[PDB]
């Protein structure tokens, strides 16, 4: 059975006006800004951007990839597909 989300989990993450996007739950570095309560720091593959999202907008990657893991015209999306499949745990700093 599922646990709560944890750093390193792979997802597609949804935000308004954007397709379901390949992403991971990030750690918070010592000294870094902490997320709001009940939100997680989401790192978006390809764009390398970060947003704070709650579980309603996080779809586990294994279950969802068949629906959401197809090429998209949006900037960064296809690079992000490569990252989540091929090196989802690397430093992209």
UniProtKB/Swiss-Prot annotation:
Compartments in which it is found: Nucleus; Cytoplasm
All copies of domain PWWP, residue ranges: 7-64
Tissue: Widely expressed. High expression is found in heart, skeletal muscle, ovary and testis. Overexpression is frequently observed in hepatocellular carcinoma samples.
Domain of life: Eukaryota
Homology family: Belongs to the HDGF family.
Subunit architecture: Interacts with HDGF. Interacts with trimethylated 'Lys-36' of histone H3 (H3K36me3). Interacts with trimethylated 'Lys-79' of histone H3 (H3K79me3), but has higher affinity for H3K36me3. Interacts with IWS1. Interacts with H2AX, POGZ, RBBP8 and CBX1. Interacts with histones H3K9me3, H3K27me3 and H3K36me2. Interacts with DPF3a (isoform 2 of DPF3/BAF45C). Interacts with SMARCA4/BRG1/BAF190A, SMARCC1/BAF155 and SMARCD1/BAF60A in a DPF3a-dependent manner.
The protein's role, per its UniProt record: Acts as an epigenetic regulator of myogenesis in cooperation with DPF3a (isoform 2 of DPF3/BAF45C). Associates with the BAF complex via its interaction with DPF3a and HDGFL2-DPF3a activate myogenic genes by increasing chromatin accessibility through recruitment of SMARCA4/BRG1/BAF190A (ATPase subunit of the BAF complex) to myogenic gene promoters. Promotes the repair of DNA double-strand breaks (DSBs) through the homologous recombination pathway by facilitating the recruitment of the DNA endonuclease RBBP8 to the DSBs.
Annotated protein name in UniProt: Hepatoma-derived growth factor-related protein 2
């Amino acid at each position: 059975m599922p646990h709560a989300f944890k750093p390193g989990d792979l997802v597609f993450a949804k935000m308004k006006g954007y397709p379901h996007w390949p992403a991971r739950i990030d750690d918070i570095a010592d000294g870094a800004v902490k997320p709001p309560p009940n939100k997680y720091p989401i790192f978006f593959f390809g764009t390398h951007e970060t947003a704070f999202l709650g579980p309603k907008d996080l779809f586990p990657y294994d279950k969802s990839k068949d629906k959401y893991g197809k090429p998209n015209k949006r900037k960064g999306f296809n690079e992000g597909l490569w990252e989540i499949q091929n090196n989802p745990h690397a430093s992209y700093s």
